Structure formats: C-alpha cells, structure tokens
Design an enzyme around this catalytic site. Structure first.
Site, PDB file in Angstrom:
ATOM      1  N   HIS A 112      25.188 -19.022 -26.713  1.00 12.71           N
ATOM      2  CA  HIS A 112      25.220 -20.011 -27.825  1.00 12.71           C
ATOM      3  C   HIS A 112      26.040 -21.147 -27.447  1.00 12.71           C
ATOM      4  O   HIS A 112      25.645 -22.323 -27.619  1.00 12.71           O
ATOM      5  CB  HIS A 112      25.710 -19.390 -29.074  1.00 12.71           C
ATOM      6  CG  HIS A 112      25.994 -20.406 -30.175  1.00 12.71           C
ATOM      7  ND1 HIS A 112      24.985 -21.189 -30.725  1.00 12.71           N
ATOM      8  CD2 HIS A 112      27.134 -20.711 -30.839  1.00 12.71           C
ATOM      9  CE1 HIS A 112      25.507 -21.905 -31.729  1.00 12.71           C
ATOM     10  NE2 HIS A 112      26.824 -21.650 -31.809  1.00 12.71           N
ATOM     11  N   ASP A 156      25.072 -27.695 -32.870  1.00 12.09           N
ATOM     12  CA  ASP A 156      25.302 -26.360 -33.393  1.00 12.09           C
ATOM     13  C   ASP A 156      24.187 -25.863 -34.290  1.00 12.09           C
ATOM     14  O   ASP A 156      23.937 -24.667 -34.360  1.00 12.09           O
ATOM     15  CB  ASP A 156      26.603 -26.362 -34.121  1.00 12.09           C
ATOM     16  CG  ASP A 156      27.178 -25.002 -34.309  1.00 12.09           C
ATOM     17  OD1 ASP A 156      26.935 -24.076 -33.462  1.00 12.09           O
ATOM     18  OD2 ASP A 156      27.924 -24.855 -35.291  1.00 12.09           O
ATOM     19  N   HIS A 194      33.541 -24.204 -28.601  1.00  9.83           N
ATOM     20  CA  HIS A 194      33.665 -24.294 -30.091  1.00  9.83           C
ATOM     21  C   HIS A 194      33.501 -22.970 -30.808  1.00  9.83           C
ATOM     22  O   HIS A 194      33.818 -22.897 -31.964  1.00  9.83           O
ATOM     23  CB  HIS A 194      32.633 -25.278 -30.641  1.00  9.83           C
ATOM     24  CG  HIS A 194      31.280 -24.655 -30.815  1.00  9.83           C
ATOM     25  ND1 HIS A 194      30.381 -24.495 -29.783  1.00  9.83           N
ATOM     26  CD2 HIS A 194      30.696 -24.133 -31.920  1.00  9.83           C
ATOM     27  CE1 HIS A 194      29.314 -23.850 -30.274  1.00  9.83           C
ATOM     28  NE2 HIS A 194      29.473 -23.666 -31.582  1.00  9.83           N
ATOM     29  N   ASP A 195      32.928 -21.957 -30.205  1.00  5.59           N
ATOM     30  CA  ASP A 195      32.939 -20.601 -30.805  1.00  5.59           C
ATOM     31  C   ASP A 195      33.702 -19.536 -30.029  1.00  5.59           C
ATOM     32  O   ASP A 195      33.410 -18.358 -30.263  1.00  5.59           O
ATOM     33  CB  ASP A 195      31.528 -20.064 -31.085  1.00  5.59           C
ATOM     34  CG  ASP A 195      30.887 -20.691 -32.395  1.00  5.59           C
ATOM     35  OD1 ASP A 195      31.626 -20.857 -33.406  1.00  5.59           O
ATOM     36  OD2 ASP A 195      29.712 -20.764 -32.524  1.00  5.59           O
ATOM     37  N   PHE A 220      17.185 -22.567 -45.486  1.00  2.00           N
ATOM     38  CA  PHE A 220      18.170 -23.203 -44.578  1.00  2.00           C
ATOM     39  C   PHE A 220      17.669 -24.558 -44.041  1.00  2.00           C
ATOM     40  O   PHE A 220      18.434 -25.530 -43.957  1.00  2.00           O
ATOM     41  CB  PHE A 220      18.478 -22.300 -43.411  1.00  2.00           C
ATOM     42  CG  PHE A 220      19.582 -22.856 -42.479  1.00  2.00           C
ATOM     43  CD1 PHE A 220      20.866 -23.029 -42.956  1.00  2.00           C
ATOM     44  CD2 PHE A 220      19.260 -23.335 -41.216  1.00  2.00           C
ATOM     45  CE1 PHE A 220      21.850 -23.537 -42.120  1.00  2.00           C
ATOM     46  CE2 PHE A 220      20.234 -23.889 -40.385  1.00  2.00           C
ATOM     47  CZ  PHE A 220      21.513 -23.942 -40.801  1.00  2.00           C
ATOM     48  N   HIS A 269      26.912 -15.410 -31.540  1.00  2.00           N
ATOM     49  CA  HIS A 269      28.059 -16.226 -31.273  1.00  2.00           C
ATOM     50  C   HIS A 269      28.743 -15.831 -29.969  1.00  2.00           C
ATOM     51  O   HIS A 269      29.945 -15.503 -29.916  1.00  2.00           O
ATOM     52  CB  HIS A 269      29.058 -16.218 -32.412  1.00  2.00           C
ATOM     53  CG  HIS A 269      28.566 -16.816 -33.697  1.00  2.00           C
ATOM     54  ND1 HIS A 269      28.070 -16.045 -34.746  1.00  2.00           N
ATOM     55  CD2 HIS A 269      28.462 -18.103 -34.092  1.00  2.00           C
ATOM     56  CE1 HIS A 269      27.713 -16.830 -35.734  1.00  2.00           C
ATOM     57  NE2 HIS A 269      27.913 -18.087 -35.359  1.00  2.00           N
ATOM     58  N   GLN A 307      14.957 -18.662 -43.838  1.00  2.00           N
ATOM     59  CA  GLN A 307      14.912 -19.831 -42.946  1.00  2.00           C
ATOM     60  C   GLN A 307      14.368 -21.084 -43.571  1.00  2.00           C
ATOM     61  O   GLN A 307      14.804 -22.169 -43.334  1.00  2.00           O
ATOM     62  CB  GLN A 307      14.041 -19.529 -41.708  1.00  2.00           C
ATOM     63  CG  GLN A 307      14.645 -18.479 -40.848  1.00  2.00           C
ATOM     64  CD  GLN A 307      16.009 -18.913 -40.368  1.00  2.00           C
ATOM     65  OE1 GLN A 307      16.198 -20.023 -39.697  1.00  2.00           O
ATOM     66  NE2 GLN A 307      16.994 -18.134 -40.788  1.00  2.00           N
TER      67      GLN A 307
HETATM   68  N1  LIG Z   1      18.769 -20.255 -38.199  1.00  4.96           N
HETATM   69  C1  LIG Z   1      19.791 -20.289 -39.123  1.00  4.96           C
HETATM   70  N2  LIG Z   1      19.680 -19.816 -40.356  1.00  4.96           N
HETATM   71  C2  LIG Z   1      20.668 -19.793 -41.286  1.00  4.96           C
HETATM   72  N3  LIG Z   1      21.890 -20.302 -41.056  1.00  4.96           N
HETATM   73  C3  LIG Z   1      22.139 -20.847 -39.862  1.00  4.96           C
HETATM   74  C4  LIG Z   1      21.123 -20.861 -38.782  1.00  4.96           C
HETATM   75  N4  LIG Z   1      21.655 -21.447 -37.680  1.00  4.96           N
HETATM   76  C5  LIG Z   1      22.910 -21.773 -38.009  1.00  4.96           C
HETATM   77  N5  LIG Z   1      23.221 -21.403 -39.316  1.00  4.96           N
HETATM   78  C6  LIG Z   1      24.452 -21.592 -40.115  1.00  4.96           C
HETATM   79  O1  LIG Z   1      25.242 -22.565 -39.405  1.00  4.96           O
HETATM   80  C7  LIG Z   1      26.563 -21.941 -39.062  1.00  4.96           C
HETATM   81  C8  LIG Z   1      26.884 -22.581 -37.685  1.00  4.96           C
HETATM   82  O2  LIG Z   1      28.131 -22.289 -37.171  1.00  4.96           O
HETATM   83  P1  LIG Z   1      28.463 -21.069 -36.069  1.00  4.96           P
HETATM   84  O3  LIG Z   1      27.669 -19.882 -36.771  1.00  4.96           O
HETATM   85  O4  LIG Z   1      30.104 -20.770 -35.899  1.00  4.96           O
HETATM   86  O5  LIG Z   1      27.701 -21.387 -34.738  1.00  4.96           O
HETATM   87  C9  LIG Z   1      26.237 -20.424 -39.190  1.00  4.96           C
HETATM   88  O6  LIG Z   1      27.292 -19.457 -39.113  1.00  4.96           O
HETATM   89  C10 LIG Z   1      25.316 -20.372 -40.406  1.00  4.96           C
HETATM   90  O7  LIG Z   1      26.062 -20.704 -41.578  1.00  4.96           O
HETATM   91 MG   LIG Z   2      31.539 -21.853 -35.284  1.00  2.93          MG
HETATM   92 ZN   LIG Z   3      28.379 -22.426 -33.032  1.00  4.37          ZN
END
Ligand SMILES: Nc1ncnc2c1ncn2[C@@H]1O[C@H](COP(=O)(O)O)[C@@H](O)[C@H]1O
Ligand SMILES: [Mg+2]
Ligand SMILES: [Zn+2]
Ligand SMILES: Nc1ncnc2c1ncn2[C@@H]1O[C@@H]2COP(=O)(O)O[C@H]2[C@H]1O
Ligand SMILES: [Mg+2]
Ligand SMILES: [Zn+2]
Lengths: 324, 333
Positions: free
Chosen positions: A87, A232, A123-124, A286, A83, A283
């Site tokens: 990213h 995202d 956004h982060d 997810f 993050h 993965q």
């Molecule tokens: N490769 C991945 N595997 C598992 N969860 C993911 C992955 N990429 C994104 N996420 C999820 O999506 C969210 C996206 O928001 P952010 O992490 O603030 O960028 C994450 O914190 C996880 O919950």
């Molecule tokens: Mg976020």
């Molecule tokens: Zn993000």
C-alpha cells in the site's frame, strides 16, 4: 550497489517493468512485490528517487537511502492485508504520477517534491490493522496519548522519524538545519492530511482554489495535501482488477476488526460486520460520497491532465452498481 | 470528610480567607498553600466546586473528587519553581473569577463551566520545567511522539485522563455517555488553547467577537452557537494562564521570580548542550525588567485589552492593575 537498490531474485524482469510502468496510472504493485521478494516499497522508492535526481539533489548517500527504506518497509506489518508496505509503495507511485500533470509543470520546489514522496512512503508505517475510531473506543494507549486526534497518523510519523535516528539511517544528514526544519514541518503536515477527519476541510480548500498560479507556500502545500490524500484514496480510480484486489484486502482487514469488536461485545465499527455488510453497495457509497467528490475536484484543478482517472472511477462505480 | 476536603493545620484561617477572597481578583495562592500544608490545589478546587454546586449537579462523590485532586496535585512537580500545583490553583481560581463577569451571565452551560474549571486544574500537570521549543530543539521523546505539536499540552491532557482510570478516581463516573464525550472534547480543546503558539489565532477570534458585539445593537452578542462559546472559553483559560502581570504587584513579582528561575535553569541546560539559548533563558544576557515591559506590550496587554472590551466594564480593575504594573517596571529600568 545493485540496479534496484536492494538485491532481488528477478532483476531483469523488474527492470523491464519499471521502465514501462513507473509513469503509468495503474501499476501492479502486487507483482512488483512478488518479483522483488517483499521489496516493492524499497525498489519503487529507489527508482523514483533516481529518476527525479533526488539522491543527487539532496546529497543523499544511496546506501543510507536503501538502509532507511528497508527499515521502514520491514516496519510495516506483512500480516496486515491492506495497510502494509505494498500500500505504501502504491501510494508513493501514484503520488509520483500525480505530480507529472503538465498543469503542475515547473511549480513545486525540489524540497517540496522530496517531502510529498517521502511522506507517501512513510504514511502508514507500523499500522496495526485497525482504525483510529477502534483505538478510541477501546481506550487504546496511543488513543490516550494523542488525545483522540489523528491517532495513527501521528504514530506513523513518530515511527518514521525515530528510524531516521538509527546508526547510519539518517538520509537527510546532508541538508542544512533550515532545509531540515522546513522539510520536517512539511512531512508532518502531509502525513496528517491522510487522516479522514481532514478530508472535508482539504477538499473545501481545493474547490476554493480551483474556483480561481501559486507562489505562496500556503496554496502549494494545500495542493500537496490534497494530492497525497488523492493517492491514498486512489484505489477506486485504478483499473478494476487492481481496485478489486486492494478492496478484498481492505475488507479482510476491516472484517477482522469487526470480529475483535464483536468478540468484545461492542457496536461493530462501520463496514466491519462480516454478517450484513453489502460489499458492492459499500463501495458505491464510498465512491459517491467520498472518492468521486475528491477526484472530480482534483481533475478540475489539473484540467484535462487526469481525465483517465475520473473516467475509470466512473466506470468502476457503474460496474459495482450492476453486480449488487 | 474534613471542612476543606483534606485536613489541615489551619482550618479557621483558611475558612476565612476562602469566604472573603475566592470571588476576588488576585488571591494569595502561596499563603493558602502554606496554610493548607501544600494543598492549595486540592482545597481551592473543592471549595470552588462546592460554591458552584458542581458536585451536586454532576453527582460527583466528594471522596472521589478529593482523591482525584490529590493525585493531580502530586503529579505536578513541587521542585519546578513556577509550573507546579500552586500555578494550577491560581489559574483555576482566576478562571472562576472571570466567569463571574455580568456580561457573561447565563452564557455558559453547567457542563462548559465544569470543563473550563477542570481544565484549568489539570492544564500543566507533570510539567517538567522546560518549554515546548526546548523539547523540540533537543528532539526529546515527547516532541518526537507529538510531532512538535502542542507537546506539553498534549502530555498534560494524557496524564490527567489516565489518573481518571485509577481505582476510585473517576470523578465523572455518573455523567451519561454523550456527556462524558462532549466533556472530554471540550477539556482537550481548552488545555490545547493554553499552547502559546495558539495565542495570535485565538486573540484574532476574540477580536472578531468584540467587533461583532459592538455592531449588534442589542449590545448583547448571539452565543446560541457552541463554537463561538468555546472560543470565548479558550480565550478565557489563556487569559487566566497569563494573568500574572495583571495581579497585585507583590504577587505578580513573586510569580515572575519563579518563572525566571525556571527559564534560567533551562538556558543552563541549553548552554550545556551547546544549543541556541531560548529568549528569556539566559542568565548571562537577560534583563528581567525590560523583558516584562516587552511581554506586557506585545502579548499581555493586547490580550487583556480585548478580553476587557468583550466584557466591558466588568474587568476594568484587571487592565488598570496591568497598566500600573507595566509603568512600575518601566520606571525600574
Ligand atoms: N475501497 C475503499 N472503500 C472504503 N473505504 C476506503 C477505500 N479505500 C480507502 N478507504 C478509506 O480511506 C481511508 C484511507 O486511509 P488509510 O486506510 O490509513 O490508508 C481508509 O482507512 C478508509 O476510511
Ligand atoms: Mg493512514
Ligand atoms: Zn494509506
Ligand atoms: N511574566 C511572564 N513573562 C514571560 N512569559 C510569560 C509570563 N507569564 C506567562 N508567560 C508565558 O505564558 C506561558 C503560559 O504557559 P505556561 O503556564 O505552560 O508557561 C508560559 C510562558 O510562555
Ligand atoms: Mg502550559
Ligand atoms: Zn499554565
């Protein structure tokens, strides 16, 4: 004013790559960041904004732009593996790419394009490398302050907008009050759409829409919320080498969180346990339950302008099923 | 522990008034504040939580309750004319009255009742005397922090749950985990329902439930569902907050003199900052009487009418007093 907004040690190599890569799916942001010396967000944003005439259109002073973007970039935490500003830059570029589907040609006002791309870049911002749920189980100050709702997303927005307040950083200083109010509300709604706790509702909205045209704000804005949230969550639909890179980083961040959750005697948060999390299974799960349902719908919306994305997503899913 | 939680100079007066008035519509909260030496909030809450057996049911230590309440009470600003601890005690007692309607008998769990009454007591804690819109228009810090969204309601919540931290102040210390967390969610949803920009949305939900009750035919509404029930409680605390115009005229007028003072102070600040002066905040332009008739016609009467329709005929006196008050102000134009 340098070619990429801020000076870099490899201006010619970055120019070659930007001219070939910025409208492609699947950009090596890691290399852009190494060549630009920490400035992928800043250089990517600058060149996206020039390419879409957004600086000219909104009378944004290009010095003020670069100064603000450098501030935001240095507000992301370099020592956070995922993050960080890389990213952000990836999310930004992927949003820029998503907007160019033929099916969406001539639909969004400039102000709305400005909104979603600004949102993506911020956004982060100032992410600390733990999740919302962790803030809430520790009773962290920001969790208390935001009453458990969108704790980080709210913080990201607050930081971005406090930076606009700094001497000579006000990139929207030349919009009228009416355009600045509608811009602010749009940006808020967009970064809030990145909160996982909204994923189910946004996706039911997008499904509904596809199951039917759009000159009501209401629909456009729901499409842009889905779009940034898609960007995202784009990593698993990226070429595999880039997917795996982003994944190694996310997991290193989560696992680090699991250790503060373990070294404080608490119920280690999900996918955060070094001991017994199955990374390849994690993965596949997810993709099946979160990322595939989203991209299928998005791709249904823009039929067939995003078929590659849904194809790579399906391949990386199968690749992992095999390497468990 | 003294009869009323805190000690007062007038225990027997207060006993009498609490014994007769607390299940009535329209209680003279100012006099109860005067009689208890500024502890209307604390004494009203203690006494309602007693009459509801809520201390006993939730194993809340009465000294812990009193301690927490004094802190909340202190954190309301006594120099703000309207949004002070007396407003809170009004809202709390009025929510307590509204739960009594025969059409609501056994609808709500104890934890729901606990939630809405706690919420009412805290719902404006730390109010500084200016609206959301003002904090947004000035980009005050709170407004930046909360992204323009339920700014004060979020801050009221933050302050109330922090005081629960503090040494020997955790009134909810004996609830289970699944309970403190269902409580926490409800309380948040309930104080957020006091943000005026939710009014329209909430009132449409309440309209839906009225129409859904009239077409049911056992004339009773199905409320096995938590999410319907919470809608009702959301509307209810919002009713209670906007109950002043349907209170006996004498009281409504006093509440209103306070509210206009606060509003006029805010428009002074706006003027001084060279900003748009908010509706009802301009001492140079506002017509108090006209503004009340208008607030009653457009916001208050449609809310109460719908509330009264849901619990028909249990809240008739409310709508009547609201309409007589309307008509009184119309004639004084
Ligand atoms: N490769 C991945 N595997 C598992 N969860 C993911 C992955 N990429 C994104 N996420 C999820 O999506 C969210 C996206 O928001 P952010 O992490 O603030 O960028 C994450 O914190 C996880 O919950
Ligand atoms: Mg976020
Ligand atoms: Zn993000
Ligand atoms: N008599 C009145 N006239 C105008 N607005 C009112 C009146 N009584 C209550 N309100 C409004 O209702 C709001 C309820 O929120 P507060 O108790 O935070 O502050 C309040 C004002 O918007
Ligand atoms: Mg309030
Ligand atoms: Zn109130």
């Amino acid at each position: 004013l340098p070619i990429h907004g801020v000076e870099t040690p490899n201006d010619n190599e970055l120019e070659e790559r930007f001219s070939l890569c910025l409208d492609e799916w699947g950009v090596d942001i890691f290399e852009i960041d190494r060549l630009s010396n920490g400035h992928a967000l800043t250089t990517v944003a600058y060149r996206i904004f020039q390419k879409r005439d957004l600086l000219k259109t909104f009378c944004i002073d290009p010095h003020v732009f670069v100064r603000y973007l450098l501030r935001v970039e240095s507000t992301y935490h370099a020592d956070v593996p995922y993050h960080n500003s890389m990213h952000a830059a990836d999310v930004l570029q992927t949003a820029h790419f998503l907007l160019q589907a033929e099916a969406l040609d001539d639909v969004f006002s400039d102000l709305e394009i400005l909104a979603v791309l600004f949102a993506a870049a911020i956004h982060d911002v100032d992410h600390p490398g733990v999740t919302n749920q962790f803030l809430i189980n520790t009773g962290h100050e920001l969790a208390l302050q935001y009453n458990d709702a969108s704790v980080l997303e709210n913080h990201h927005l607050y930081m971005a907008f406090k930076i606009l307040t700094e001497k000579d950083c006000d990139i929207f200083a030349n919009l009228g009050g009416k355009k600045r109010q509608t811009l602010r509300r749009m940006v808020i709604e967009l970064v809030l759409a990145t909160d996982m706790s909204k994923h189910m509702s946004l996706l039911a909205d997008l499904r509904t829409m596809v199951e039917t045209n759009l000159d009501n704000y209401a629909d456009r804005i729901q499409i842009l919320q889905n779009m940034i949230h898609c960007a995202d969550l784009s990593n698993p639909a990226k070429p595999l080498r880039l997917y795996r890179k982003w994944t190694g980083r996310l997991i290193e961040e989560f696992f680090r969180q699991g250790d503060k959750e373990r070294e404080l005697s608490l119920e280690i948060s999900p996918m955060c346990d070094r001991e017994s999390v199955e990374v390849e299974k994690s993965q596949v799960s997810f993709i099946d339950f979160v990322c595939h349902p989203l991209w299928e719908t998005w791709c249904d919306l823009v039929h067939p302008c995003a078929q590659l994305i849904l194809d790579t997503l399906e391949d990386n899913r199968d690749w992992y099923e095999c390497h468990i």
